[PDB]
Amino acid sequence: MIIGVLAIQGDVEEHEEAIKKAGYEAKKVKRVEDLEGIDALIIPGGESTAIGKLMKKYGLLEKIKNSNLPILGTCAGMVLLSKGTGINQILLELMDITVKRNAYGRQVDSFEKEIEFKDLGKVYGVFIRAPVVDKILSDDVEVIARDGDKIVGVKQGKYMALSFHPELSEDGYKVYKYFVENCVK
């Protein structure tokens, strides 16, 4: 099992380690050629617009849209997978959801708390500039995690989107394993 992690820019040693702990092989996807030979792709990150621009600039945008790869989008990845955010920006438009960016505001740096994952249990999630699901556009979109009235985790077939950064907590590997076992295998 080879799990690719999008990092056109940035360091993904944390994501790679979590993938290894989950029991899989990790692969850094920096350029379009790296997408070959992977079983799934994880799209992490903080600020979504910069990543959207990088995907287009280096061609990963159209390549991903042209693939049938299972994808786990975390934070920036949740935004990118969506079909709308209310603001004009580059999106993959794959998952049947719209997203509300900076759902918890921009005055607080971060927050950490246990999140109940559907059919799994509690996972420690680190939220930094976290977006949340707004509209759900399809009957096959499944809510897998909530934080109060906010939807912080959804699944649609081979796609999964989360508000927090799994790689920032010791529970990261559990989340990655949950994604692979339910969206890839």
Curated annotation (Swiss-Prot):
L-glutamine binds at G46, E47, S48, R101, I128, R129. The active site is at C75 (nucleophile), H165 (charge relay system), E167 (charge relay system). NCBIfam families: PLP_synth_Pdx2. GO terms for cellular component: cytosol; glutaminase complex. CDD domains: GATase1_PB (cd01749). Keywords: Glutamine amidotransferase, Hydrolase, Lyase, Pyridoxal phosphate. Belongs to the glutaminase PdxT/SNO family. One of its GO terms (molecular function) is glutaminase activity. Catalyzes the hydrolysis of glutamine to glutamate and ammonia as part of the biosynthesis of pyridoxal 5'-phosphate. The resulting ammonia molecule is channeled to the active site of PdxS. This is Pyridoxal 5'-phosphate synthase subunit PdxT. The keyword Amino-acid biosynthesis does not apply. In the presence of PdxS, forms a dodecamer of heterodimers. Only shows activity in the heterodimer. Its EC number is 4.3.3.6, 3.5.1.2. One of its GO terms (biological process) is pyridoxine metabolic process. It comes from the Archaea. It catalyses: aldehydo-D-ribose 5-phosphate + D-glyceraldehyde 3-phosphate + L-glutamine = pyridoxal 5'-phosphate + L-glutamate + phosphate + 3 H2O + H(+); L-glutamine + H2O = L-glutamate + NH4(+). The keyword Iron does not apply. Pathway: Cofactor biosynthesis; pyridoxal 5'-phosphate biosynthesis. InterPro entries: Class_I_gatase-like, PdxT/SNO, PdxT/SNO_CS.
